[PDB]
Design a binder for this molecule. Structure first.
Ligand SMILES: *[C@@H]1O[C@H](CO)[C@@H](O[C@@H]2O[C@H](CO)[C@@H](O[C@@H]3O[C@H](CO[C@H]4O[C@H](CO[C@H]5O[C@H](CO)[C@@H](O)[C@H](O)[C@@H]5O)[C@@H](O)[C@H](O)[C@@H]4O)[C@@H](O)[C@H](O[C@H]4O[C@H](CO)[C@@H](O)[C@H](O)[C@@H]4O[C@H]4O[C@H](CO)[C@@H](O)[C@H](O)[C@@H]4O[C@H]4O[C@H](CO)[C@@H](O)[C@H](O)[C@@H]4O)[C@@H]3O)[C@H](O)[C@H]2NC(C)=O)[C@H](O)[C@H]1NC(C)=O
Ligand SMILES: *[C@@H]1O[C@H](CO)[C@@H](O[C@@H]2O[C@H](CO)[C@@H](O[C@@H]3O[C@H](CO[C@H]4O[C@H](CO[C@H]5O[C@H](CO)[C@@H](O)[C@H](O)[C@@H]5O)[C@@H](O)[C@H](O[C@H]5O[C@H](CO)[C@@H](O)[C@H](O)[C@@H]5O)[C@@H]4O)[C@@H](O)[C@H](O[C@H]4O[C@H](CO)[C@@H](O)[C@H](O)[C@@H]4O[C@H]4O[C@H](CO)[C@@H](O)[C@H](O)[C@@H]4O)[C@@H]3O)[C@H](O)[C@H]2NC(C)=O)[C@H](O)[C@H]1NC(C)=O
Ligand SMILES: *[C@@H]1O[C@H](CO)[C@@H](O[C@@H]2O[C@H](CO)[C@@H](O[C@@H]3O[C@H](CO[C@H]4O[C@H](CO)[C@@H](O)[C@H](O)[C@@H]4O)[C@@H](O)[C@H](O[C@H]4O[C@H](CO)[C@@H](O)[C@H](O)[C@@H]4O[C@H]4O[C@H](CO)[C@@H](O)[C@H](O)[C@@H]4O)[C@@H]3O)[C@H](O)[C@H]2NC(C)=O)[C@H](O)[C@H]1NC(C)=O
Ligand SMILES: *[C@@H]1O[C@H](CO)[C@@H](O[C@@H]2O[C@H](CO)[C@@H](O[C@@H]3O[C@H](CO[C@H]4O[C@H](CO)[C@@H](O)[C@H](O)[C@@H]4O)[C@@H](O)[C@H](O[C@H]4O[C@H](CO)[C@@H](O)[C@H](O)[C@@H]4O)[C@@H]3O)[C@H](O)[C@H]2NC(C)=O)[C@H](O)[C@H]1NC(C)=O
Ligand SMILES: *[C@@H]1O[C@H](CO)[C@@H](O[C@@H]2O[C@H](CO)[C@@H](O[C@@H]3O[C@H](CO)[C@@H](O)[C@H](O[C@H]4O[C@H](CO)[C@@H](O)[C@H](O)[C@@H]4O)[C@@H]3O)[C@H](O)[C@H]2NC(C)=O)[C@H](O)[C@H]1NC(C)=O
Ligand SMILES: *[C@@H]1O[C@H](CO)[C@@H](O[C@@H]2O[C@H](CO)[C@@H](O[C@@H]3O[C@H](CO)[C@@H](O)[C@H](O[C@H]4O[C@H](CO)[C@@H](O)[C@H](O)[C@@H]4O)[C@@H]3O)[C@H](O)[C@H]2NC(C)=O)[C@H](O)[C@H]1NC(C)=O
Ligand SMILES: *[C@@H]1O[C@H](CO)[C@@H](O[C@@H]2O[C@H](CO)[C@@H](O[C@@H]3O[C@H](CO)[C@@H](O)[C@H](O)[C@@H]3O)[C@H](O)[C@H]2NC(C)=O)[C@H](O)[C@H]1NC(C)=O
Ligand SMILES: *[C@@H]1O[C@H](CO)[C@@H](O[C@@H]2O[C@H](CO)[C@@H](O[C@@H]3O[C@H](CO)[C@@H](O)[C@H](O)[C@@H]3O)[C@H](O)[C@H]2NC(C)=O)[C@H](O)[C@H]1NC(C)=O
Ligand SMILES: *[C@@H]1O[C@H](CO)[C@@H](O[C@@H]2O[C@H](CO)[C@@H](O[C@@H]3O[C@H](CO)[C@@H](O)[C@H](O)[C@@H]3O)[C@H](O)[C@H]2NC(C)=O)[C@H](O)[C@H]1NC(C)=O
Ligand SMILES: *[C@@H]1O[C@H](CO)[C@@H](O[C@@H]2O[C@H](CO)[C@@H](O)[C@H](O)[C@H]2NC(C)=O)[C@H](O)[C@H]1NC(C)=O
Ligand SMILES: *[C@@H]1O[C@H](CO)[C@@H](O[C@@H]2O[C@H](CO)[C@@H](O)[C@H](O)[C@H]2NC(C)=O)[C@H](O)[C@H]1NC(C)=O
Ligand SMILES: *[C@@H]1O[C@H](CO)[C@@H](O[C@@H]2O[C@H](CO)[C@@H](O)[C@H](O)[C@H]2NC(C)=O)[C@H](O)[C@H]1NC(C)=O
Ligand SMILES: *[C@@H]1O[C@H](CO)[C@@H](O)[C@H](O)[C@H]1NC(C)=O
Lengths: 494, 135, 135, 134, 50, 50
């Protein structure tokens, strides 16, 4: 006869959902409080077994989005509240009219001709474009200045100061007032109190591995053909902890990605047309961003013992811009070719009819780009870069977009919400002095849209969280069950 | 590292078939042997650092060990038991079947087998006490 | 449910007399099997919930094992000991006495008996190994 | 108190020589036996929280797991197949205390643990093969 | 909304409705006598029985 | 005054009889000065959850 037998130590596993310990290297303040210091081991062992992996329906992937947002919540909780400064601020009428906040324009608007010549300008580091801004024009000004009183800690007297916002940080009350002072509030101070970012968050890159607690292991699908929904991995490697991961948030692109590789693999979400593409580290797709004018920060005290970092600078430098550089056009075309041969995508194969275009405008969140570097965000039109990369007929909207250039204009917004999960509103302090940030592009956020058999689009998308699905897309978390029950003729006996 | 390979050495047998697979007792014990060491190391200087999973790491260990103590098979690679096997169609193929490939097939009736053997040990437990009391 | 009946089965014999009672080992082991999964189940989706009493369930279990192992009789329903009986007036009535009932009579001298055995085990502990060291 | 002396009685062996040293089981077991009782007493009415309360549990399971890790639980002297490391360090059983020699071997103690862990696995594997055969 | 970003509910109703009331209902008088009878026979209560 | 700490906004809240105390005096104005029932002893919160 056959009897049940118990075996211990059998190497089996199953799906699992448990929290994870985080480990970090450059722990300015976040180490020993939420994450351990790093160990520094990356050896993995290959197994001759098959297991299913997903990049969207993964416990590790979902937790990573939560942990980053959760970490940010603790950072801003003790910081200062900017409720008091929601008061009318006298502002320069001649300066708000220029950027159209008030929309008070009369007469003027004289006719002028358009040269419509050349406009194939390109720039590389040796030229004088980088050093002095000064790059063909259209980089002129972006500033506004106002006043407010803001009685300080001594609740007996006031002290008038000056702070200079940007164009996209104020909403002004239109009216028939002839005074040179234009009453104008903040952007979102009548919706919810906004708290500063009086910390070093966003001032330095953040990296941290993920380590599963004992009794739980991580599996990785090493097959080069991985796409996202493939449940059969020829090569699978077990590990104790995951690789590093960049915690940078941006739109239309992903910078400083650790998963750059010589191959232009594509991660596809089979359930719909959601897509992310990883570029190649062979064309040196570096991009450099600069903003001119070296800045001064004058902390101001409010009635809580805390400090509000203002920018009383009266200088009027040119607006921020980025020139990308490197071999781009030859690099992009390889992405289109890869899409053709990839499984799924039962669409056209005409390489010069598949075109990379931005979504249909609407809200500024999806219309512009969004890149953060060393504490100051920048959003750029990106029309010219799209215009020059494909070399399309320059009949797009107004004459301002006619040019084909390797650089694009940008502006600064200071009242920014954390795009990560849903919402909120926070204030980013301004950095003293000049900023120059350099990065390497190593991913691409895009939704592939096509309804007919012709003219497929590689449409950009503004889902910042999608980046985290590229760093740990091939990782799976499995709980180990060392108990195995199998029959055996042997009996317990006595 | 040796611990990394050691902790990952248990799964090296996953590719082998059931008959040719070499069992690894003490694997969980060695897993927790260094886990606290890593957690303890540099600790001297919401639940991740706190006890949301640290107790779960303890909990996983006690459950598995208490599982054996409940069944009376602790510290033994194999323990023959008086309970008979259930429906016998799901016969393991000891030549060309991995442990995992077959654990899922029997997973359907795994819960029922758990209940059946628990009662059996109690009955055997009752017999042992009666014999001891007699003598 | 089986767990509800199983966990509550320990007291099923509480009404029986001393001798007629059937001792139930694994009561803590079996309870720790099913009690924890109740917490674990749906937990994936102050003190009572997280850590004030959850560990106390662990603390309770280890106490029996630590208490058992300090006395050197773990995993044994009955182990004979060298310590002589204290004052014999409290002679058990094996026919018409219940375990808890008789336990309440010994509770007065329960503390003192605990100390005597612990010292006694140390003496045997010293002798048992020293004989191995001797030869 | 009896518990105070009991916890403080084990260390009395420290002065004794290795040969005359009286090995004591239950040293850690009894220490956690009453420490939990001490904190439990009057608790009904970090230091109070689980900052260190589990650490005692973690410390206990560490040694208990280590004994089970090496397969020598509850055996004051278990002989193993591992061969001795460098023979220069030899205990002086007549005039050496436990710590006077424990510190010296501490330099190579880690390697012995790593080497011994592999040895148990090798012996472990043999047991399964013999059991499987018969 | 108040000076904390939060909301305080208000009742700007101007019409005047009838005041609130409750009508119980059901066989009640028969119920309370049974309560009285139970107290008579309840242990303790060294009191009257009328 | 509301969240925008630069201007006022008049509302009306209709209280009940047992949630107000009114100043007694020789005032003749049609307006009656009254305060909340218990705001001069402690700060009151709103049963803000459900
Ligand atoms: C993608 O990845 C890219 C690669 O990393 C990113 O680009 C890089 O981003 C990092 C930040 O993560 C930058 O490093 C930082 O640069 C800061 C500015 O550096 C200036 O000076 C450089 C000259 O210094 C040389 O020598 C030093 C020492 O040997 C060496 O470390 C350095 O690399 C360089 O060789 C010059 O080359 C630069 O152009 C700048 O002019 C630098 O200050 C940062 O150091 C900070 O922070 C670290 C911790 O991260 C601290 O350990 C340091 O002590 C220092 O902290 C001090 O400075 C901070 C910033 O100024 C202050 O906030 C602090 O308070 C602190 O002290 C201040 O207060 C004191 C009070 O007395 C003052 O006395 C001090 O002067 C301070 O004011 C850090 O090294 C890289 O430069 C950058 N590289 C490139 C090519 O851009 C990229 O950003 C990523 N992607 C995106 C989108 O961002
Ligand atoms: C542990 O973690 C791992 C990951 O690490 C988890 O793995 C994932 O597990 C889930 C759930 O177990 C799986 O989802 C299931 O996938 C199957 C298979 O899907 C593929 O094959 C489909 C086959 O269908 C064709 O062929 C059959 C015959 O075989 C025909 O009858 C059909 O008509 C079809 O012709 C195919 O259709 C699928 O297409 C999908 O993908 C392509 C791109 O490849 C798209 O273009 C398609 O549009 C489509 O999105 C796919 O290729 C699915 O079939 C399952 O769907 C059923 O169940 C769903 C949930 O109930 C339900 O919403 C669906 O409508 C469908 O309904 C079926 O079941 C109902 C209930 O029984 C019936 O009433 C109904 O009639 C129908 O029968 C399901 O989605 C994941 O694939 C798997 N892997 C990954 C990467 O996610 C694992 O689950 C975790 N847990 C455990 C315990 O392991
Ligand atoms: C989707 O993405 C694809 C991929 O790039 C993109 O394809 C490009 O389309 C444009 C057209 O919009 C192409 O430009 C044309 O190229 C042909 C071919 O010439 C090749 O060979 C010559 C050498 O003989 C090279 O010098 C040249 O660079 C090419 O390699 C040209 O013949 C076209 O000529 C134009 O100018 C002529 C006058 O000189 C005109 O007579 C002619 O009609 C064309 O007019 C257009 O260009 C003028 C330039 O000044 C402009 O003034 C006009 O208004 C008009 O726009 C033309 O240059 C380009 O080669 C394609 N490249 C690739 C890689 O496919 C798609 O356009 C894009 N589509 C969408 C919708 O996004
Ligand atoms: C990512 O994006 C691409 C396009 O960019 C999507 O591709 C489309 O996928 C849908 C899937 O539903 C395709 O629709 C299918 O069309 C098949 C073609 O036969 C007829 O289809 C309709 C009627 O169904 C006719 O109008 C047409 O002229 C054809 O004669 C049908 O066989 C399919 O029928 C099934 O679905 C329908 C509902 O859609 C049911 O009513 C049916 O009973 C049946 O179950 C289906 O309709 C569409 O053609 C594709 N676009 C193309 C080819 O250009 C991808 O689907 C999208 N990714 C994901 C995961 O959705
Ligand atoms: C072993 O334990 C037994 C059980 O207790 C013990 O004999 C019993 O002791 C109890 C009290 O310890 C006695 O109860 C008596 O009750 C009467 C009233 O009914 C009292 O008057 C008694 O008081 C006298 O006896 C006490 C000791 O018994 C004296 O301390 C006191 O000063 C009085 O002189 C007492 O409370 C019970 O009668 C006895 N016998 C039984 C139960 O058969 C026995 O002494 C213990 N062995 C020892 C101490 O060596
Ligand atoms: C078994 O264990 C014994 C005990 O340690 C061990 O003997 C020791 O060997 C080490 C070398 O590994 C000796 O270290 C020397 O110490 C003297 C001072 O006592 C120094 O002068 C020596 O310096 C030389 O060597 C250095 C090492 O690179 C050089 O950097 C330096 O420039 C000099 O050339 C050296 O450090 C030690 O003295 C002995 N004795 C003791 C008691 O430690 C023995 O080798 C071990 N054998 C095995 C097989 O394990
Ligand atoms: C921001 O606000 C500060 C005040 O907190 C402004 O400081 C003021 O700056 C003006 C311009 O420099 C000073 O004008 C002075 O006028 C006298 C007239 O004789 C002249 O001799 C001085 O050389 C100087 O030009 C003014 O005194 C000064 N006031 C204070 C209290 O410091 C500052 O200008 C503002 N920033 C701007 C407008 O960009
Ligand atoms: C791929 O990109 C092209 C370029 O934008 C998309 O074509 C655009 O489609 C939208 C939706 O139909 C058009 O919106 C409407 O167009 C009409 C004229 O057709 C206009 O009168 C309306 O006011 C509105 O703008 C848009 O014009 C059209 N743009 C162009 C240049 O043709 C195309 O839809 C994308 N692919 C897919 C599958 O969506
Ligand atoms: C307090 O609540 C009352 C509602 O009971 C509000 O009264 C209403 O106030 C508006 C103006 O704020 C009145 O509209 C005006 O009415 C006059 C009446 O002669 C008319 O001539 C105007 O053309 C205009 O329509 C409205 O009639 C009035 N309703 C009433 C009294 O029933 C009052 O606004 C609230 N107090 C506030 C908001 O401060
Ligand atoms: C996966 O690879 C392992 C080896 O790493 C294979 O294990 C061997 O399988 C053969 C199959 O006949 C046996 O004869 C050997 O005894 C096994 N062990 C060794 C060490 O070779 C395993 O079979 C492979 N599995 C698959 C599905 O390819
Ligand atoms: C709305 O605003 C315009 C522009 O400010 C006002 O135009 C003024 O009209 C008065 C006569 O009504 C003239 O004296 C002024 O010269 C005009 N310009 C300015 C700048 O005031 C217009 O009157 C306003 N309409 C109103 C208040 O109803
Ligand atoms: C308190 O208020 C009442 C009501 O207004 C006052 O009553 C008047 O008192 C004066 C004398 O002070 C009389 O001459 C009047 O006839 C009273 N009635 C009116 C309608 O005025 C009362 O005086 C006030 N108390 C004071 C002023 O101390
Ligand atoms: C794609 O273009 C060809 C050529 O103009 C045309 O015949 C075909 O109908 C187009 N596709 C669709 C879906 O109409």
């Amino acid at each position: 006869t056959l009897y049940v037998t118990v075996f211990y130590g059998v190497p089996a596993w199953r799906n699992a959902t448990i929290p994870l310990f985080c480990a970090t290297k450059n722990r300015d303040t976040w180490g020993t409080t939420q994450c351990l210091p790093d160990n520094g081991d990356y050896s993995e062992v290959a197994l001759n077994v098959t297991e299913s992996f997903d990049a969207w329906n993964n416990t590790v992937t979902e937790q990573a989005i939560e942990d980053v947002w959760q970490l940010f919540e603790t950072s801003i909780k003790p910081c200062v509240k900017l409720s008091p400064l929601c008061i009318t601020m006298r502002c320069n009428k001649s300066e708000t009219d220029r950027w159209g906040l008030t929309k008070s324009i009369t007469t003027t608007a004289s006719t002028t001709s358009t040269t419509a010549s050349a406009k194939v300008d390109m720039v590389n580091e040796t030229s004088s474009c980088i050093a002095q801004d000064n790059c063909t024009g259209l980089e002129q000004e972006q500033m506004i200045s106002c006043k407010f009183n803001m009685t300080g800690l001594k609740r007996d007297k006031t002290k008038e100061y000056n702070e200079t916002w940007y164009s996209a940080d104020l909403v002004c009350e239109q009216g028939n007032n002839t005074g040179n002072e234009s009453r104008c509030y903040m952007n979102h101070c009548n919706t919810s109190v906004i708290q500063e970012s009086c910390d070093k968050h966003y001032w330095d890159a953040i990296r941290f591995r993920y380590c599963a607690p004992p009794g739980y292991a991580l599996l990785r699908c090493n097959d080069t053909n991985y796409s996202g929904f493939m449940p059969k991995c020829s090569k699978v490697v077990v590990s104790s902890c995951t690789r590093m991961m960049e915690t940078q948030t941006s739109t239309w692109f992903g910078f400083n990605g650790t998963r750059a590789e010589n191959r232009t693999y594509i991660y596809w979400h089979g359930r719909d047309n959601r897509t992310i593409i990883s570029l190649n580290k062979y064309y040196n797709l570096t991009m450099k961003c600069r903003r001119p004018g070296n800045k001064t920060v004058l902390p101001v005290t409010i009635m809580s013992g805390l400090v509000f970092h203002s920018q009383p600078i009266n200088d009027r430098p040119k607006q921020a811009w980025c020139w990308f550089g490197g071999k781009w056009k030859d690099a992009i075309k390889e992405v289109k070719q890869t899409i053709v041969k990839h499984p799924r995508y039962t669409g056209t194969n005409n390489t010069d009819k598949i075109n990379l275009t931005a979504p249909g405008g609407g809200d500024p969140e999806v219309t512009f780009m969004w890149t953060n570097c060393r504490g100051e965000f920048l959003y750029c039109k990106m029309n010219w870069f799209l215009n020059w990369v494909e070399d399309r007929n320059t009949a797009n909207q107004k004459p301002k977009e006619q040019h084909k250039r390797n650089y694009v204009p940008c502006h600064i917004r200071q009242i920014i919400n954390t795009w990560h999960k849903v919402g909120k509103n926070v204030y980013l302090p301004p950095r003293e002095g000049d900023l120059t940030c350099n990065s390497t592009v190593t991913s691409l956020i895009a939704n592939i849209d096509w309804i007919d058999g012709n003219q497929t689009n590689i449409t950009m998308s503004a889902e910042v969280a999608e980046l985290y699905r590229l760093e740990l897309g091939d990782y799976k978390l499995v709980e180990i069950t060392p108990i195995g029950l199998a029959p055996t003729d042997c009996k317990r006996y006595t | 590292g040796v611990f990394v390979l050691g902790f990952l050495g248990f799964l090296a047998t996953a590719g082998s078939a059931m008959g040719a697979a070499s069992l690894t007792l003490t694997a969980q014990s060695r897993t927790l042997l260094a886990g606290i060491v890593q957690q303890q190391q540099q600790l001297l200087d919401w639940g991740t650092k706190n006890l949301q999973t640290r107790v779960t790491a303890i909990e996983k260990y006690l459950k598995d060990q208490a599982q054996l103590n409940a069944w009376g098979c602790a510290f033994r690679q194999v323990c023959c038991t008086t309970v008979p096997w259930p429906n016998a169609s799901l016969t393991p193929k000891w030549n060309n079947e991995t442990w995992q490939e077959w654990e899922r097939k029997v997973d359907f009736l795994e819960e029922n087998i758990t209940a059946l053997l628990e009662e059996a040990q109690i009955q055997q437990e009752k017999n042992m006490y009666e014999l001891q009391k007699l003598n």
